[PDB]
Amino acid sequence: DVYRLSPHVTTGFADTFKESNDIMGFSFMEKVNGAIYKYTHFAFYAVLNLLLAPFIAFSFGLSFAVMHFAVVWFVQPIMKLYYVWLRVFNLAYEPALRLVCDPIHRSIALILSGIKGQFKMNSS
Amino acid sequence: DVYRLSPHVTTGFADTFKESNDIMGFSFMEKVNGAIYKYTHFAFYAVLNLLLAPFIAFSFGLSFAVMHFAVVWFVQPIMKLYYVWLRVFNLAYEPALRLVCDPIHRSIALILSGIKGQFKMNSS
Amino acid sequence: DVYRLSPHVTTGFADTFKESNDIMGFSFMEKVNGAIYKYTHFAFYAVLNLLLAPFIAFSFGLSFAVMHFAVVWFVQPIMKLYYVWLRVFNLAYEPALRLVCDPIHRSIALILSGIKGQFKMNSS
Amino acid sequence: DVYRLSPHVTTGFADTFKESNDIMGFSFMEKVNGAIYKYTHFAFYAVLNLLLAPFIAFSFGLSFAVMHFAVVWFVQPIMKLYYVWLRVFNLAYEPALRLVCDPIHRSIALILSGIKGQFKMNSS
Amino acid sequence: DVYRLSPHVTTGFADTFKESNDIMGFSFMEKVNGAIYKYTHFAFYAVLNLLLAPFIAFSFGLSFAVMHFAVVWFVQPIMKLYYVWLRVFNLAYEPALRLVCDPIHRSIALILSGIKGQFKMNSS
Amino acid sequence: DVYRLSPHVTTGFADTFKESNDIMGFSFMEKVNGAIYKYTHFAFYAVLNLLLAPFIAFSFGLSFAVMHFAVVWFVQPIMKLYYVWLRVFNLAYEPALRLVCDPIHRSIALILSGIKGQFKMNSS
Amino acid sequence: DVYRLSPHVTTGFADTFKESNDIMGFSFMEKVNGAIYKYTHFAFYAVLNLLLAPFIAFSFGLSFAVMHFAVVWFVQPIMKLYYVWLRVFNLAYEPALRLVCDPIHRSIALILSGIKGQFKMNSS
Amino acid sequence: DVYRLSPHVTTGFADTFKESNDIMGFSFMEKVNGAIYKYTHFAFYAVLNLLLAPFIAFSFGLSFAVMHFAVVWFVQPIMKLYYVWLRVFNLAYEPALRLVCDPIHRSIALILSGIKGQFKMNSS
Amino acid sequence: DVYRLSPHVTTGFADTFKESNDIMGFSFMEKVNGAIYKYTHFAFYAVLNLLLAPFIAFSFGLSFAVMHFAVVWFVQPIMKLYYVWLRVFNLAYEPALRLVCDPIHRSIALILSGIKGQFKMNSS
Amino acid sequence: DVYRLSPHVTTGFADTFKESNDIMGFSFMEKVNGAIYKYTHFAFYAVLNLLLAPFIAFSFGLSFAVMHFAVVWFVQPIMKLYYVWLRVFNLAYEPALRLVCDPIHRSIALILSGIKGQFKMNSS
Amino acid sequence: DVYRLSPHVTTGFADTFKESNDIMGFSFMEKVNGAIYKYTHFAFYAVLNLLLAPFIAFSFGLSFAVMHFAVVWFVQPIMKLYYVWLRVFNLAYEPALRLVCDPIHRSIALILSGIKGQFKMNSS
């Protein structure tokens, strides 16, 4: 699928404040920092979602409805008529080109008709 | 098939307002937002379809009827006559070109007639 | 076959007014729209076919008869005489070219006569 | 065979007035149109064949007789003498060219005499 | 994943003050040096972490909350509309280009339709 | 064989006045036309052969006798002496060229001595 | 690992004062020379290590502590924000480029769709 | 063998006055023509051979005797001395060139040391 | 290993005063010459080794001690800090380049997605 | 072997006065001509060999003795000293070049580390 | 081995005065000529070897002793110090180059990630 949104960027605590085996502090502070980060993030995202989510959903639902009706019932039939004319053109175009092109490429194919070889193998 | 309409763009709620394991709000708001979006979309598309669909179908059915009659009963026989003349031309064109081209390419094919080699293999 | 007419453009109702899982109206309107489209198309194509088909068939049958007689009984024997002369020319042309060309390409073939190699493989 | 006439162009009724599953008229008219086309074609070709075929056959038989006698009994022996002289020239031409060419191409063949490699494979 | 932080740089004592079999001092000094290095590193990192970690976590949690809300609920729907228009353009663009391009590349494909060869193998 | 005459051009009745399944006349006229063509061809070729064949055969037999005696007993020994001198020249030419050429091409062969790879396969 | 220190230079006695089977002195002098070299090297390296090692270890431990704190807690979050913006740009960039590029490369792929060949093998 | 005379040109009756299945005269004339040709050729070649063969054989035997003595006992030892000097030159030439060339080509060989791949297969 | 001394030059008596099967003197002189050469070589190398070896060993042991201390305890930590900065730069550099480069190369990969072929084999 | 004399030129009676199946004289004359040729050749070569062979052998034996002594006992030791100096130069030359060259070619090797493919096969 | 003397030039009697099956003299003279050649060669080489061999052996033994002492005990340690500095330079050089080069070559590797194909085989 070409029109699929690519995956998000990992942002978890251990994926953004990342340490190796050589880097350490006190053990108990890790949980405190992680809890602070996670709860701040959640508490600030949730209120915005609750306050502003419905209106955007309504607006974009209505907009997509109109867009999809237009596409399905005015664009596709026109494209089909266009395709009819394209086929009519191809009927005249393709054979005429093949006439002049095919003999040359059939002739050039004779370069690969003389292969011969000998081989010997060993193993242990 | 060349003249086939390509697949649509995914637009479902979870495919347009997409989140990862790091992004969350309150659980119950998800269903509310999804229901609002889906029902708005359906209720706005259905009325337009009901009101305006039949006339477009009638018009394009009539148009396609005329187009297809023209194509089937005036274009294809003409193309067949054209093809007859094309074959007549090929009869004279192809052998004359092959005469001058084939000897050269048969001669050049001799470059691949001297392959020899030796090999040894091991495994464990 | 070079002179074969390419396949038609799909034009069925579900192949021109095409929808996905995300796009829906009322269920019953689909059958109404499909019936309107199909019956309009058929009723408009059938009358034209009935009224105008025979004359075109007669005319093109007569035309093709004349064309094919001309091709079979005046063009092909002439092409055969032409081919006789072409063979006579080739008898003199091909050996003379091969004389000067073959030694060079036989000599160049010696580039591929010194292949050697060693290998070892593993698997699990 | 180089001097063989290429196959004809398909011209049958269903191969020139061609329809798909989407294109239809009344059922009975198809047989009427096909019969009209086929019988017109046959009735117009047969009379011309009967009236004019024998004279063309006689003329071209006589012409081909003369042509083939000329080719068999005056051209081929001359070509054979020409070939004798060609062989005499090759005797002097080929070894002299091979003298100067072969050492270089034998030397260049040493580029492919140092292949070595290692591999490992897995499967499941 | 494109947006993943690359692994750290190894900095352990034996990985930064590295010696070979040819380089040696007294045995007991190795432990003294290693202990000094490790404990200095830990004692200086831990205090900074304890003193300054929470505020940075809070700030970046709040910042990421705002950023992610913006991305999820204002950018993606706009991109989806953009994709709708892109599909509409492709419907007209692709077949027209394929019409003129495909015959040429189908014709050029005939260069690989004349392969022949002979081989002989030996083993021991 | 380089000096072999290439095969004739097919000229039989059904190979020069050729028809397909779509092209037909009355059945009985086919045999009449074929008989006329074949018998005219044979009756015109046979008399010419009978009247003029022996003299050409005698003349070309005598001519070829003289030509072959000249070739066998004056050209080939001279070519053998020429070959002796050619070998004498090669003795001095080839080693001197190989001296300067071989080291370079042995050196360039080292480009293919570092191949390594890993693979994994699946099947069902 | 990109940031790993490469292996040392071999410096052992037999690896720096190296002889072959053709080069020999008295047997007993080899041990004397080896002992002198090894003990001088060890006695001069050990005192320097003992005298100067601890201070360098302390200094670099403190320095690395500060550096790693800076990297972990000020650089990585900024890079993550940068990555968010990069993803937003890619959403608009990639599909638009693929629209114009893919048809051409799909068309060019038709060059490899006409392969045919025949082979014969022998063994002993 | 480089100095071997290439095969003669076929000149038999059926190989120079050649006909196909489409070309025929009276049956009995074929044997008459063949006998005339063959006996004329033989009767004219045999007398010349008998009259003039011995003197040419004597002359060329004497000439080849002198030529071969010269080659065997004056040219080959001189070529051997020349070869001695050539070897002396190679001793100095080859190692010096390999010194400057080999490192570069060993270095360039590293381009083929990073191959990896995955595959899947199906059959029926 | 890059910093390993390459093998010596063979200098044994039979490897420097080398003869073939065609070159011979009296048998007993070979042993005399070999003994003279070998004993002169050994007697002249041994005294120099005994007289001058220890001082060079002492000097180079001391020198290498100082060099290795400098390398291990002043260069490597600095290189590690440099590597830290290099990683910090890469974090910003690599994703930005991949953004603009990957779509193009993914698109160009479509040239190899249309392979088809047919084959036939024989053996005996 | 580079300094080996290439094989002689075939000069036997049937290999220099060569005939095919189409060329014949009286049977008995063949033996007469062959005997004359062979005996003349032998009788003229043998006397020259007997009269002049010993002196050339003596002269060239003496000459080769002097040449080979010079080569074995004055050229080869000098070449060995030259080789010693060459090795000394290589010790300094090769690592320095590899330093600057290897990283680039290791980097360029990454072009072949992304191979993937799918296949399907059929047989009968 | 690079510094190995290449094999001698064959000089035996039958390898320098070489004849084929077509070239012959009296049988008994062959042994006389061979004996003369061989004994002259041996008798002239042996006296020179006996008279002049020892002094050259002594001189070159002494010379090689001095040369090898110099190489082993003054050149190799210096080269080792040089190698230490070379490694120090590489530590800084290689990662910096890999930083800018690797992303580009990883990106270009995506050209080989789209292979697909179909095949059919036959045998008899």
Numbering used by the authors:
A (entry chain F), B (entry chain G), C (entry chain H), D (entry chain I), E (entry chain E), F (entry chain J), ...: 29 to 152
Paper text:
Unlike vesicle coat proteins such as clathrin, COPI, and COPII that cycle on and off membranes and share evolutionary origins and structural features, caveolins are unrelated in sequence to other vesicle coat proteins and remain integrated in membranes throughout their life cycle. Using a combination of computational and structural approaches, we now show that caveolins across evolution share the ability to assemble into amphipathic disk–shaped multimers composed of spiraling α-helices and a central protruding parallel β-barrel. Each complex forms a disk with 11 spiraling α-helices and a central β-barrel, with each protomer forming contacts with two protomers to the left and two to the right.
We used single-particle cryo-EM to determine a 3.1 Å resolution structure of the S. purpuratus caveolin complex and built a model spanning amino acids 29–152. The complex, ∼130 Å in diameter and ∼36 Å in height, is composed of 11 spiraling α-helical protomers organized into a disk with a protruding β-barrel. The variable N-terminal region extends along the cytoplasmic face of the complex before making a 180° turn at the hook structure. An unstructured detergent micelle covers the hydrophobic face of the disk and reaches into the interior of the β-barrel, suggesting both regions interact with membrane. 2D averages of vitrified S. purpuratus caveolin complexes showed variations of curvature, including examples of complexes with either concave or convex curvatures. Calculated using a filter resolution of 8 Å, these low-resolution structures represent the negative and positive values along the reaction coordinate for the component with the largest variance. Thus, we conclude that the S. purpuratus caveolin complex is more flexible than the human or S. rosetta caveolin complexes under these experimental conditions.
